[PDB]
């Protein structure tokens, strides 16, 4: 497993250093590649740091020439992607690849500050399904769109959490999505409450209470 970090909101003309930390294997004996992928687009190779045996050689791409530096810190078992004079068209998911791919980190080039989601409990007005409870949390107006993860205080057999991709709002840069929980009625009895735990970007998490019907 390759751990990735150092991504996030970056101002235009600003910089970011993406970290690619290997676990259970030494990076020193491996050529580290960096690949990007823009929202709903394909794969574009960025560059590579060669294995220490071949004098740590670096072959890059033309599309971002002079603005990227791929380095390696063998003492920290981590490879880096230093990105300078960042443009909006640099906004993408970046992955490090060694036989393995990192989880990848989102890079957003914007002059806008992060906005924390406004998390609201939702109660059904329409029909409660046969022997189940359906509850939801509205995750409104957040920026950047990722990372956003929603977890619930209830799990197990017969429990299904549905998480929808963030979608862009009508104006501005905010995104909106929701999270749904379906669970046995027995597991969400009247007078009981449940929690949707919303983790977004680097901001502190939110624990919103959702009453059982």
């Amino acid at each position: 497993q390759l751990v990735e970090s150092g991504g996030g909101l970056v101002q235009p003309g600003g910089s970011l250093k993406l970290s690619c930390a290997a676990s259970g294997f030494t990076l020193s004996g491996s050529n580290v590649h960096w690949v990007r992928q823009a929202s709903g687009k394909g794969l574009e190779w960025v560059g590579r740091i060669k294995r220490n045996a071949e004098s740590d050689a670096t072959a890059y791409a033309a599309s971002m020439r002079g603005r990227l530096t791929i380095s390696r810190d063998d003492s920290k078992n981590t490879a880096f992607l230093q990105m300078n004079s960042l443009k909006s068209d640099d906004t993408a998911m970046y992955y490090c690849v060694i036989r393995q791919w990192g989880q990848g980190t989102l890079v957003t080039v914007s002059s806008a500050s992060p906005t924390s989601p406004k998390v609201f409990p939702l109660s059904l007005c329409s029909t409660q399904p046969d022997g189940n409870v359906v509850i939801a949390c509205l995750v409104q107006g957040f920026f950047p769109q990722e990372p956003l993860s929603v977890t619930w205080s209830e799990s197990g057999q017969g429990v299904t959490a549905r998480n929808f991709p963030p979608s862009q709002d009508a104006s501005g840069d905010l995104y909106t999505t929701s999270s749904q929980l379906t669970l046995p009625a027995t597991q969400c009895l009247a007078g009981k409450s449940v929690t949707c735990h919303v983790k977004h970007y680097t901001n502190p998490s939110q624990d919103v209470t959702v009453p059982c019907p």
Binding site: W101, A136, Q180
Partner: protein
């Protein structure tokens, strides 16, 4: 090196074979007999995972249903019996010479039986109404095909704006999709109208399904 994939989109009935073609602008053939050609599968949100390396060698923990073939310029990825977990975007990739280039990506979608969505409507919560915004949420669960039309209506008047939606990835087990549609209004607009409805039209529904509520009556 330019990498061209064919087809760029494919629907596969569960249990059926599938093949994906990849064409390189130059020979990927090497001295060891093999080729400098890889195949990856990437699921929505997820990172790409290797399937094949050296043109015909199956990666770690990849089912024997997956096969790589071809030489020089024309390559083929074969899937013996497509399973729900095979859904995703397949990429061919050359590592012959820099820049390492990828094919456009072939979206493989499981062509399962028609399943109508279950529809749920959630009125704006008081906690949001306090803020001065009013969002109405319409959720659709486990439908197939992906094509579903959610129409918002306020006092029987169709909305052409104020809504946004997102669809989950094709499920890795049941091959269905789920959708969230949000109608966002100002609290002032929300207080001035009575009926709030989301009308869902889908191949699995004989007639459209409408979930509605009257404001303040829930």
């Amino acid at each position: 090196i330019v990498m061209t994939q064919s087809p760029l989109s494919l629907s596969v009935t569960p249990g059926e074979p599938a093949s994906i073609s990849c064409r390189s602008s130059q020979s990927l053939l090497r001295r060891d007999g093999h080729n400098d050609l890889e195949w990856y599968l990437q699921k929505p949100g997820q990172s790409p995972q290797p399937l094949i390396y050296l043109g015909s060698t199956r990666a770690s923990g990849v089912p024997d249903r997956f096969s790589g073939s071809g030489s020089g310029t024309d390559f083929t990825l074969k899937i013996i019996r497509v399973e729900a977990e095979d859904a995703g975007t397949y990429y061919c990739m050359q590592n012959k010479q820099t820049p390492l280039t990828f094919g456009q990506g072939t979206r493989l979608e499981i062509k399962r039986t028609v399943a109508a969505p279950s529809v749920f409507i959630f009125p704006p919560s008081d906690e949001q109404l306090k803020s001065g915004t009013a969002s109405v949420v319409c959720l659709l669960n486990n439908f197939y095909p992906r094509e579903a039309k959610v129409q918002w209506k306020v006092d029987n008047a169709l909305q052409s704006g104020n809504s946004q939606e997102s669809v989950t990835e094709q499920d890795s087990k049941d091959s269905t999709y789920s959708l969230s549609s949000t109608l966002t209004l100002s609290k002032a607009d929300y207080e001035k109208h009575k009926v709030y409805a989301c009308e869902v039209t889908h191949q699995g529904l004989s007639s459209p399904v409408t979930k509605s509520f009257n404001r303040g009556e829930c």
